[PDB]
Amino acid sequence: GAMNNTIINSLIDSIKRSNVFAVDSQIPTLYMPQYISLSGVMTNDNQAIASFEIRDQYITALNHLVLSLELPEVKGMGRFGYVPYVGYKCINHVSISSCNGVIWEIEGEELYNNCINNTIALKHSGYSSELNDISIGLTPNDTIKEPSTVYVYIKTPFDVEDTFSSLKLSDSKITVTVTFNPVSDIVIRDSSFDFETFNKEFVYVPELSFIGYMVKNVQIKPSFIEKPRRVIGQINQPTATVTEVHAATSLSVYTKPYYGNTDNKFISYPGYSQDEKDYIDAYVSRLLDDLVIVSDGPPTGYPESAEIVEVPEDGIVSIQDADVYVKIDNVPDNMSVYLHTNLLMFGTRKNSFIYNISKKFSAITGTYSDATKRTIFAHISHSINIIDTSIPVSLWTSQRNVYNGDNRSAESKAKDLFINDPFIKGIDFKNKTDIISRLEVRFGNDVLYSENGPISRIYNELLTKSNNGTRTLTFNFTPKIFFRPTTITANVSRGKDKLSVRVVYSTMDVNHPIYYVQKQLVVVCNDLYKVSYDQGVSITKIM
Amino acid sequence: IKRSNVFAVDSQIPTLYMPQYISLSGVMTNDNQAIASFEIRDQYITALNHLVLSLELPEVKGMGRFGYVPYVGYKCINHVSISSCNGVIWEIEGEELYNNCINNTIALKHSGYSSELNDISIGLTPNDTIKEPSTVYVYIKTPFDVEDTFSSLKLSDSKITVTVTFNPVSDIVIRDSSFDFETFNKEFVYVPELSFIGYMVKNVQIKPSFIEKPRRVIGQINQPTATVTEVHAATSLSVYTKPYYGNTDNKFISYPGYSQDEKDYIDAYVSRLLDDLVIVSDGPPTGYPESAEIVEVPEDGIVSIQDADVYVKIDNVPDNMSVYLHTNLLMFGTRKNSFIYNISKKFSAITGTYSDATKRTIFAHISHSINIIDTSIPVSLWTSQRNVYNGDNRSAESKAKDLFINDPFIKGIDFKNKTDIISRLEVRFGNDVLYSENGPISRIYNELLTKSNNGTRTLTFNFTPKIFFRPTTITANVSRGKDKLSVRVVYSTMDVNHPIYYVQKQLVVVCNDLYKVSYDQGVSITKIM
Amino acid sequence: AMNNTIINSLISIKRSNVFAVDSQIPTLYMPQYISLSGVMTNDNQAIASFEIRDQYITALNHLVLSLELPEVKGMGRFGYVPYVGYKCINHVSISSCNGVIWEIEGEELYNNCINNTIALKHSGYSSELNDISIGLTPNDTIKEPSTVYVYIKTPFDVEDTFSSLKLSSKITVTVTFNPVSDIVIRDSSFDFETFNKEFVYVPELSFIGYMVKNVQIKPSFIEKPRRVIGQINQPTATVTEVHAATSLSVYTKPYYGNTDNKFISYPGYSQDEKDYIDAYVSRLLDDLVIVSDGPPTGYPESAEIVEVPEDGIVSIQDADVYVKIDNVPDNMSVYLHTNLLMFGTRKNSFIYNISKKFSAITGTYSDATKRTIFAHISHSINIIDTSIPVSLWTSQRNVYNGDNRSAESKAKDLFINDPFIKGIDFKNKTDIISRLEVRFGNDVLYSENGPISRIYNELLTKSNNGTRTLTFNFTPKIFFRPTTITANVSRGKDKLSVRVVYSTMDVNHPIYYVQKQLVVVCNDLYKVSYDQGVSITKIM
Numbered sequence A: 001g002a003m004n005n006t007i008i009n010s011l012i013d014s015i016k017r018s019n020v021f022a023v024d025s026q027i028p029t030l031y032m033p034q035y036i037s038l039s040g041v042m043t044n045d046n047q048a049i050a051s052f053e054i055r056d057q058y059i060t061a062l063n064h065l066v067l068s069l070e071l072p073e074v075k076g077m078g079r080f081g082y083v084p085y086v087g088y089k090c091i092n093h094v095s096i097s098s099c100n101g102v103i104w105e106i107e108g109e110e111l112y113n114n115c116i117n118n119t120i121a122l123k124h125s126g127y128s129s130e131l132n133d134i135s136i137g138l139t140p141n142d143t144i145k146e147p148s149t150v151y152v153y154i155k156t157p158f159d160v161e162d163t164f165s166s167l168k169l170s171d172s173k174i175t176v177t178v179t180f181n182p183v184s185d186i187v188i189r190d191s192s193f194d195f196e197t198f199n200k201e202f203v204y205v206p207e208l209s210f211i212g213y214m215v216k217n218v219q220i221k222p223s224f225i226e227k228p229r230r231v232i233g234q235i236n237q238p239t240a241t242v243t244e245v246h247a248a249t250s251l252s253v254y255t256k257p258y259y260g261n262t263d264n265k266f267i268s269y270p271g272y273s274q275d276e277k278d279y280i281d282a283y284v285s286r287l288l289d290d291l292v293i294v295s296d297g298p299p300t301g302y303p304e305s306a307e308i309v310e311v312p313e314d315g316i317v318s319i320q321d322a323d324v325y326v327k328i329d330n331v332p333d334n335m336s337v338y339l340h341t342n343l344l345m346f347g348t349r350k351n352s353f354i355y356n357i358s359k360k361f362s363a364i365t366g367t368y369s370d371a372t373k374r375t376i377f378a379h380i381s382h383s384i385n386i387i388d389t390s391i392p393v394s395l396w397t398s399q400r401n402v403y404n405g406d407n408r409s410a411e412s413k414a415k416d417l418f419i420n421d422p423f424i425k426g427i428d429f430k431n432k433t434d435i436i437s438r439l440e441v442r443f444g445n446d447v448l449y450s451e452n453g454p455i456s457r458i459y460n461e462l463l464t465k466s467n468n469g470t471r472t473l474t475f476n477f478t479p480k481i482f483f484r485p486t487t488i489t490a491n492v493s494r495g496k497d498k499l500s501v502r503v504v505y506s507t508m509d510v511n512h513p514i515y516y517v518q519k520q521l522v523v524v525c526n527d528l529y530k531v532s533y534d535q536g537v538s539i540t541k542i543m
Numbered sequence B: 001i002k003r004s005n006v007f008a009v010d011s012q013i014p015t016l017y018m019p020q021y022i023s024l025s026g027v028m029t030n031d032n033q034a035i036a037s038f039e040i041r042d043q044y045i046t047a048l049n050h051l052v053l054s055l056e057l058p059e060v061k062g063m064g065r066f067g068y069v070p071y072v073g074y075k076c077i078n079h080v081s082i083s084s085c086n087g088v089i090w091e092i093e094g095e096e097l098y099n100n101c102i103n104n105t106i107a108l109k110h111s112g113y114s115s116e117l118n119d120i121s122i123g124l125t126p127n128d129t130i131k132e133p134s135t136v137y138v139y140i141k142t143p144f145d146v147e148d149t150f151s152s153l154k155l156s157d158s159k160i161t162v163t164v165t166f167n168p169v170s171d172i173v174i175r176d177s178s179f180d181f182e183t184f185n186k187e188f189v190y191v192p193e194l195s196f197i198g199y200m201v202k203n204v205q206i207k208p209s210f211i212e213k214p215r216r217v218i219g220q221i222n223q224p225t226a227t228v229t230e231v232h233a234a235t236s237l238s239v240y241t242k243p244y245y246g247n248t249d250n251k252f253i254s255y256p257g258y259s260q261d262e263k264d265y266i267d268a269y270v271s272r273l274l275d276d277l278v279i280v281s282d283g284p285p286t287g288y289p290e291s292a293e294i295v296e297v298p299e300d301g302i303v304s305i306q307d308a309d310v311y312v313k314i315d316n317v318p319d320n321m322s323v324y325l326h327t328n329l330l331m332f333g334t335r336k337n338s339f340i341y342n343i344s345k346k347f348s349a350i351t352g353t354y355s356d357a358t359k360r361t362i363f364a365h366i367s368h369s370i371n372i373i374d375t376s377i378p379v380s381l382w383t384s385q386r387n388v389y390n391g392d393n394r395s396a397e398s399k400a401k402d403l404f405i406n407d408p409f410i411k412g413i414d415f416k417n418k419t420d421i422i423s424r425l426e427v428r429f430g431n432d433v434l435y436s437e438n439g440p441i442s443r444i445y446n447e448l449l450t451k452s453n454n455g456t457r458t459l460t461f462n463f464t465p466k467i468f469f470r471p472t473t474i475t476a477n478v479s480r481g482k483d484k485l486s487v488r489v490v491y492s493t494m495d496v497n498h499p500i501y502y503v504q505k506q507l508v509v510v511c512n513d514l515y516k517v518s519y520d521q522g523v524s525i526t527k528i529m
Numbered sequence C: 001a002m003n004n005t006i007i008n009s010l011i012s013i014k015r016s017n018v019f020a021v022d023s024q025i026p027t028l029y030m031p032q033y034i035s036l037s038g039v040m041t042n043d044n045q046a047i048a049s050f051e052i053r054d055q056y057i058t059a060l061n062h063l064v065l066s067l068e069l070p071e072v073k074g075m076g077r078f079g080y081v082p083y084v085g086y087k088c089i090n091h092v093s094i095s096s097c098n099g100v101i102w103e104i105e106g107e108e109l110y111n112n113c114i115n116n117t118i119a120l121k122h123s124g125y126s127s128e129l130n131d132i133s134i135g136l137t138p139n140d141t142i143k144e145p146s147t148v149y150v151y152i153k154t155p156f157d158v159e160d161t162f163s164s165l166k167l168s169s170k171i172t173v174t175v176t177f178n179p180v181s182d183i184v185i186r187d188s189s190f191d192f193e194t195f196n197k198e199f200v201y202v203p204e205l206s207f208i209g210y211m212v213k214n215v216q217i218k219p220s221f222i223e224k225p226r227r228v229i230g231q232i233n234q235p236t237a238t239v240t241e242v243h244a245a246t247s248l249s250v251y252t253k254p255y256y257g258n259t260d261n262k263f264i265s266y267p268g269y270s271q272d273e274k275d276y277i278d279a280y281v282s283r284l285l286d287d288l289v290i291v292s293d294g295p296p297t298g299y300p301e302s303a304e305i306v307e308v309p310e311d312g313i314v315s316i317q318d319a320d321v322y323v324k325i326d327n328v329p330d331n332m333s334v335y336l337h338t339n340l341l342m343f344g345t346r347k348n349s350f351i352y353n354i355s356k357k358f359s360a361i362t363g364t365y366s367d368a369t370k371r372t373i374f375a376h377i378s379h380s381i382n383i384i385d386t387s388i389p390v391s392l393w394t395s396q397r398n399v400y401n402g403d404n405r406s407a408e409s410k411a412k413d414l415f416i417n418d419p420f421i422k423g424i425d426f427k428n429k430t431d432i433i434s435r436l437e438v439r440f441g442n443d444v445l446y447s448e449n450g451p452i453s454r455i456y457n458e459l460l461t462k463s464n465n466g467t468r469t470l471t472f473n474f475t476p477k478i479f480f481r482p483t484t485i486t487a488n489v490s491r492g493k494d495k496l497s498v499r500v501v502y503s504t505m506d507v508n509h510p511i512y513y514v515q516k517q518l519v520v521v522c523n524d525l526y527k528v529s530y531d532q533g534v535s536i537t538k539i540m
């Protein structure tokens, strides 16, 4: 009939077989879930702290923590926008504690790092054109940003195996403490924007939600938990050490820039569009206003240090060895095409190598609009990279620079934006440039691991199915929750009770502004702890 | 110390079976609605799962604009029911099957999601091919696929009939007035074929199982309440809104085609308006209603429509011609001295260049505040009785390009289901409040838990692993009157002078009831009470 | 707080605890990422051998082969194929002293990793690697050196530590490489001769090694793929000695032996169907619409370049082309190449003209750059057009000249030798199989008129690029003995014969002349025995 004759004959007994077509439906523990939202207590210590107390005889267990934030209406003048995934960037520290002490705690960046592969959680935290594009206010009562609510998923080890991994409450008081980063960190604004009044008026409005469970005759057994510990190395130092490492499941290593020496102001920002090309295109777009000028006679409004050359009939302008081809259509007979040959320049010695941003352009084509009296650029051939877009304005106009540096117009310089994102990694905005040439992890005196390529990041990205991973050394390949995690055992007597991380940073040119971007080595260690439920919830470090 | 082996495992010998992909041609019936019945009866088909319904879409020849709805295959389905001689084993509404498959990109692509199918193609001559014939595959996700062979529907000499009820072709087609739909509806016939993975099991040992059956309840038009009666054991409860376009002719100004992003919907609308928004003509433009206020753009370039300023600068405009702006392209007002919702006011800057060769304006950059809601307003609502103004001040040429959209699975008030119209949700089990929220936190949880971008306000009661465990359900007490689920929503406030305020709403409540699958004297399901 | 309706609903029967679990102490082990430099050997194919022998290393899984791509300096156009790393691989074989434990063909490893976005990105998928870069001076850098990571997906990764290859024995991983010609897209201007001579594969094999204290090894099962390629254009292929098979995949591949592998256009990193079409349209437009003072020069005598009338419409037979270019100088006129690319087998029969595939062309002439800037193009160009090798236009079969493009355009043509191309087009869109018949022995096992098996393969594996696959194993892997198709040697039921029916094409269309190759992949079941070293045995 429907089944083929070759199949029926292949089947139509003497061996014991496991049933793959039916299963015994196990009766589970009698419970009832409920989404519970709580309003917290706001404190200033002058850091914003929100405390949420969970105490109920019927809330037997809980997991899936979601912190909601009410972002206010932003009215006034100037340019303003929120950082991508604003909600995650608001968080400085989170700590779930009982009367016996801290059960679990995470740093704001580490929670984000754990949620970087969760697209849904990142969207909920605030990732829209309404929130992340840089909006402009024209009148003191003009609405720059409309009020919005963001949802931050606080990923905890209690979510791993849903009900099985859930934090149990043996009639104990659980307090979730959320420490907030200053509003400066989550905002991208210009000089025109009245940040002084904004910082004063802004208040974090949080609300903690969780899936609560009412369990009838709960049978609680002890469990294991992984607690992260980050160690930040000294400025520009290629070393960091994690002390008292006794039982670790993993070890992550990454870099962070230190923009302390700068005013955190940058020439361009793409907004909601976060691709590498989007960052580059925004920078090229900002420079082009001053790079190619259509004026009657030499252009005015530029510093005396600026060297603006008229484009010859051949269209090619020679800035040293570099050739720039500039051809603009429909230019009035009374006007000429001009090129800024030193828009942004850097040097350490008077007659040495020069890093000129104008030299990074090979071809510029467009058409002059008589109606709008502005140039409309068609095709741009350049060698502008993600690093160029990531240079603070301070480094161009620094003491180390023998030249003026920023030879842009006053109009362009006014459009510069303050970026204080607390979760920037590497030396560029997209964390593209791998400044670690070699990594060395020493457990005591002996070398635990060494690599010349980011093969540990490659394994991290592959194993966790993440497109943005870190150089991570995983020690636990055992199933979580149902097994005691596999940890690196420490020998205190032999001095093997600390993890020392040493990197070999890539050498950069002294005449390139990015050389002066201070680096910081971050080392994260996931320590194993045992969750005991005898006389309340309590954790103990595995040693 | 006793240790569990994590490096080796005893390879258990499974039940001796043989899978086979079986395709069946059904029986078409009509009354007034199309029905396809597929009978599965074979002594060797021991079990089955993974139902796939294929559809042969015909060649579309003639004149006018035509296109299929995205994921056309899923939109064709009105209802699906897997039944035995003892009765219905499982059944789902067309929309609910789509809702369950919205997170499956592969299943959505197979159902028909291409530029060849979803972009709006145009026919010029009565024998011009608008759309080429194509075959679409609709994955009928059933609870028998959850744990593959373990969850599969067992037969054993019993007859299984899969009944597929189809929505009218009107629902799956986007067309203009120029297209001869009358002839198309008459000529169109659904050509289905049901495929499934059949299993021939040697000495099958069948044990009873559990199944979740969805039940949707649709509220009255503009009623913020809906009640699901006889709830005894429910695994989940979903709540969402749907627009009712009965008061309209289902015609819309623009559609983006295959490109389905929010920006794509907006860009298509801006593109359609721009033809009438900025006019380059010798003297005042003609062909517009008397209600239209087309103002000549001054040397300054700025045209002031009340408080709103529009900057219009078009290059290479001939000396005999002038630049004009339609200051009231689309407007709405309940009263003569109320707020006015003007679409022309939603534009801040328009720049372009007039082409002498093609005698048309080529727009370069447009600065506007157009949203997804604007693109989702039916043309009928602009020209409604509530409007003291004309409403649609567009040209006859533009109005002719309007498209009929009858997608049966539209949610909320906009085409992208962006705008949340529920301000407060109240769920009652019997008469006592089971759940209440002021924020879409149940939806945020639904999206997080399912790893989905398009979720609903869902109340999940079952957090226990499926198939291997009896699902955790909300227990009912008939004596205490707790044998029903009543949903009440508070709709979000909007200004009466906005045309979207007049979009009729319908509250949809879906309840997943628990049933026990018994295999004694044939396949039969029993409601858990 | 918990609602009053809930507390009353709760506040004899054996219940399984879903809120707490006994934390089982696992086998004492220690993982370590181990990287090894191999031994390079040399139709003089590159072979890399990696020997794994260590007393500490007890088991291994997750093989990742890294490759150091060198700096590419010189003149001309050059670029790497998308997912370059996977394309480099010709064959991989994990073997012991007892023989081959597991082996896969380069294409099959890629086919298994086509649904893994992370693994495909790591192998080399960037604008830096896949976009076609141009060198101007003999010392100009075309491509900067880069490292690519190829994830060698093996059955030892399925259930992590449980599925891992135990070697408590010397394990040798042998990686055979495809020639550099296969992984490179270049023009005639590029000195490939010197590049092929200078290029050397620089591999390094990484794996997650495990040091297990008192390992308890039990036997396991493994699926080994076997591909059979049919004779050129033959619609039949047979896989012999089929005794226990878990699956059977069937697909088509183009054979470009009769061609010089040169193509008119390539989109680079942008790999969408529209990207492939847009690149082709962009390349043709340079010669399709010409703005010149008098008739255009530099084209063959065979070319028919007609001046566009005041009306704007040029009639190439039944087909009408609307061409209107703005700001054209007073001394110049708009011209249209009416036979840019044409094909026919008879002098006065059907003509496949690429110029006929255009309905409207609009743009503006730039006086500054002296070139036309195209705004909107209305055409009927498909993925197949972009996939036609240049050889076929200028073939002996063609009565006409064929390639009526300028010498400038013809110079820009690129050699594409990608080893993992499927179907007849670059995006594997066109379905050329009309019917599929699979026979086990002499009896028909499966038959289909539609790609319902491909639909099931795509659905079940959650892949957007699947093949016509017959799966026999729906049983959980590693923890169960896989369900296989049983053979009957006496009845002569020990082979799988695949017969297809290709949908025939128009002989006046150049794509008809693209050679086909039927590919049939069979996954045979093998038993992994650990008695006196690692060894595999075919289930019969």
Ligand SMILES: CO[C@H]1/C=C/O[C@@]2(C)Oc3c(C)c(O)c4c(O)c(c(C=O)c(O)c4c3C2=O)NC(=O)/C(C)=C\C=C\[C@H](C)[C@H](O)[C@@H](C)[C@@H](O)[C@@H](C)[C@H](OC(C)=O)[C@@H]1C
Binding pocket: A023, A479, A482, B465, B468, C159, C476, C477, C479, C480
């Ligand atoms: C993470 O989950 C693990 C917890 C282990 O630790 C324990 C203590 O907790 C268990 C729980 C909570 C179960 O639900 C089990 C289960 O359902 C089993 C088997 C019986 O092997 C089990 O042995 C367990 C089992 C444990 O040992 N399945 C069955 O009997 C049936 C009727 C079918 C099984 C089908 C396949 C073959 C199975 O799904 C496989 C593909 C894996 O997914 C599982 C083995 C899980 O391994 C992993 C690595 O994912 C484990 C359940």
